[PDB]
Amino acid sequence: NPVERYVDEVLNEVLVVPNINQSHPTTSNAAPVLDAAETGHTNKIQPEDTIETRYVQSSQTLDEMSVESFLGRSGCIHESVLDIVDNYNDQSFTKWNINLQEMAQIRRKFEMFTYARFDSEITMVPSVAAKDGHIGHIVMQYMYVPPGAPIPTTRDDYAWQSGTNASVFWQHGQPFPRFSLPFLSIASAYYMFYDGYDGDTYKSRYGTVVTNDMGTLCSRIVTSEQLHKVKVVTRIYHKAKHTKAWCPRPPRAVQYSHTHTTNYKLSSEVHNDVAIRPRTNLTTV
Amino acid sequence: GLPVYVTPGSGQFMTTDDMQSPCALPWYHPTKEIFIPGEVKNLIEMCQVDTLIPINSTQSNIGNVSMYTVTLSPQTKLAEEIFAIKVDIASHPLATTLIGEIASYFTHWTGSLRFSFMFCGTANTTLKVLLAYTPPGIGKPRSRKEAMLGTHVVWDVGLQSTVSLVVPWISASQYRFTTPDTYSSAGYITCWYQTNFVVPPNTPNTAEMLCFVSGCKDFCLRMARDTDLHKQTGPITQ
């Protein structure tokens, strides 16, 4: 009764955890607590096997631990700056090579899987700082330029016509812009990691830069030059929808250095580079 | 509440939109409708009524009833021309007729036109006239022979004072622009003497002819627009 399915969605009780059953004292030659970690399998012993448990009816649910929930929250992935200082024509537009590698918070979550396939919801938060006192009427244009399409080189480049590319025009004082994007890869899943090159020579590139080309985000202040200078900062947020992930992996332990690479820095006293806190000795809690 | 997505266009005022709005006089009950003769439901009803063409609207005539009459008389040369006008519904001698005025509130027109002529000489005056329609793609005819090669009616004046010439819809495209625009220029209507204007002795040697115009069953107008046959150059005051 799917309706029953709907009620479970509303209460977040789709995936229930099992109950603890009552157990008793035992004396046998089946020793569940004993095993061999060498096998590469986790011992499957439960509390009822080691202690004498009572019967407890588990109410906990695992909905929130789903991959959909874990990766389904908007996080900042970029902060775009259009700062008008001394030349409107040169400073009223910019571009960004799209990627989910610049902000540690969301990059780390996605990188807990080797491959992930998902649709994206992009939300933009623009804020206009009145450096001289007035913002006038700010209208912005954010254009998605897929790899190959012409990239604008001036604030009036013909590419801003957007004859085929997707552009979102936002007007100051209206709700934050937002749109969805379907799974964009030429493969079946996005590579979070890639142990490969784009050639077989000492100068070939290594890593996800070979596979994760997403294009460019070109943006500009549509409004023409105003007397008062403004600094417009547009923060881009991303959220994964309808997610699937494969082959889980260890979380990033040290800080990120660059995009598309697992490269890291190591100082002279390494314990400062990882979250591991030095213990005084084996017996000091 | 219900999540909504405000679409482009929201908040604007389009003079031709079709929305509903709250009523400023709630509970108000309008006066009962009585029957009034003469109801009009579609402007086509007005395009189907004949009105006079100010065909003789030369400068010395405008401002006179004579701008509506064409004069006929005994000729000394054969096959002379009587009048010539463009057939375009909103073109000049016929822009001020009723069908021309209504056509001027629309951008496109289609259909056949009906031109009628009423002879106003004495009952003893005779005359045969050739009324011709010249389809486009050629200049206006320079002789009766050139004109009669197109669509035409030979009108013999007699007991029935009026004749009608139908300008059939002969066009490349299904519609034409109402405003004077070459590509969709419909041709000409010319009138010539088929025989002569004969009268017995002691009878006026000249007579008038009135010209009317209306639309046939296939007449139709499209794309409403403002007219250029009327203007306002200052405030209209109390």
């Binding site: 709907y6 969605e9 509303v10 209460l11 977040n12 | 509440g1 219900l2 999540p3």
Partner: peptide, 29 residues
């Protein structure tokens, strides 16, 4: 999704979001 009921005076009692915390004040008794 919501609970339509009939007698005819339907009471479409809608809940617009997918979480129980999102709905308005509770029914009494």
């Amino acid at each position: 999704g919501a609970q339509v009921s009939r007698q005819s005076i339907n009471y479409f009692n809608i809940n617009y979001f997918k979480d129980a915390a999102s709905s308005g004040a509770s029914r009494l008794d």
